[PDB]
Design a protein around this ligand. Sequence first.
Ligand SMILES: CNC(=O)[C@H](Cc1ccccc1)NC(=O)[C@H](CC(C)C)[C@H](CSc1cccs1)C(=O)NO
Ligand SMILES: CNC(=O)[C@H](Cc1ccccc1)NC(=O)[C@H](CC(C)C)[C@H](CSc1cccs1)C(=O)NO
Ligand SMILES: [Ca+2]
Ligand SMILES: [Ca+2]
Ligand SMILES: [Zn+2]
Ligand SMILES: [Zn+2]
Lengths: 202, 202
Amino acid sequence: QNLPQRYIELVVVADHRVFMKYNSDLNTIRTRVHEIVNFINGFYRSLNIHVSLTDLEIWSNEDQINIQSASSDTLNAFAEWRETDLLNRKSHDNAQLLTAIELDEETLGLAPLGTMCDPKLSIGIVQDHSPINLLMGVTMAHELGHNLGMEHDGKDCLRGASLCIMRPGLTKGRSYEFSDDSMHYYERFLKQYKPQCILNKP
Amino acid sequence: QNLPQRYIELVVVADHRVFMKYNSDLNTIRTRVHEIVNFINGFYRSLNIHVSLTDLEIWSNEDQINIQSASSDTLNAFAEWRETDLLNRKSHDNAQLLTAIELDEETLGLAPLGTMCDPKLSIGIVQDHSPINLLMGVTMAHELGHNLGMEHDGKDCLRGASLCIMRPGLTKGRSYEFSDDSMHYYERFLKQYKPQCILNKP
Ligand SMILES: CNC(=O)[C@H](Cc1ccccc1)NC(=O)[C@H](CC(C)C)[C@H](CSc1cccs1)C(=O)NO
Ligand SMILES: CNC(=O)[C@H](Cc1ccccc1)NC(=O)[C@H](CC(C)C)[C@H](CSc1cccs1)C(=O)NO
Ligand SMILES: [Ca+2]
Ligand SMILES: [Ca+2]
Ligand SMILES: [Zn+2]
Ligand SMILES: [Zn+2]
């Protein structure tokens, strides 16, 4: 287990549909997100990654992109905007989108593989699908995981009593952990792609 | 549960018996210890502790304390040496003595409980008992665990396929982890004692 200290500067963007859903109360969205970054961190402990929230942007007025049901299409719109608007203003390593649209083929999240630190592709879309901050943490941790070159595990993946975070579907539980495969998908990525943006302590 | 980033400044002291074991070659002793620490770091990824090899003291000429079979006699003797001699020469957090003497009840390790940062009791004893750096790494990690307020786990403690590091006796294996209990023992340790010495990045 030779993994050096890495740091991710995360910016979560909450859409207009999220804004409406929590009765327009911003302090409610802030707290949820903050708790979620807390669960992510606990999961990434063994990987030696520390996830830091640099900015949380709530589209309280109007949606900056056309939020669609087709996950890959919204993924597309969010990439162009990250590059030309958010990254133009805020220096950040990764950007995740918190949408409340009921995603097409029952997709609860989507992110491209092995893309951490790419101007266009260092992103992910997470659907606000559970009132339990834990199942949302595993969700966002799952998508960040794909950014770090992690492929899926088996459906019957378990690590002790814990559920492997990189499973293809979401099963409810109380203990979730990353599998040895995930640790290996990341070890190779770090040596292969060698992400430059994740070394600075925020 | 998220545990903060802590850093232990470790000094390993190899006695004359260890010096006479590796044919007076300091290089080999240096390479044995360097790898043992790497293994300690891997076990500690989960608890957010990084261990640094601050200095390696090899008593090449003669022992500075009376090395005795009685583990407890040697522990208390090494404790007062560390406080009056070593601490006043090398600023460090914890000091582990690597001895080559066959300890009393077939003892392979001994260290004080919940004593990290103490000028006298932030110590430990490790017997050079296995030519496999991994087992040597668990032995030193077990004793640093005691220093961090960790008490023993069950006779047959298992966190998945991995053997708990805090078992009262060493069973030869290929993967080791710290159990939930050990993670809670250290949590309480941090909250209760607020050790200052483990906050600076070396
Ligand atoms: C990148 N997207 C994916 O890999 C697909 C999307 C999908 C789902 C169902 C059908 C077709 C596609 N899986 C997921 O999103 C997952 C499941 C959804 C239903 C919440 C995914 C992981 S679930 C688990 C993690 C640990 C134990 S179980 C999740 O919570 N991620 O954030
Ligand atoms: C503070 N002293 C102790 O707790 C006593 C000392 C002792 C040993 C044998 C018999 C009686 C007493 N046990 C230990 O040292 C242990 C035993 C020795 C054999 C290495 C302890 C084993 S933990 C485990 C990690 C993985 C599986 S089991 C160790 O590797 N530690 O470093
Ligand atoms: Ca960065
Ligand atoms: Ca220190
Ligand atoms: Zn996935
Ligand atoms: Zn013990």
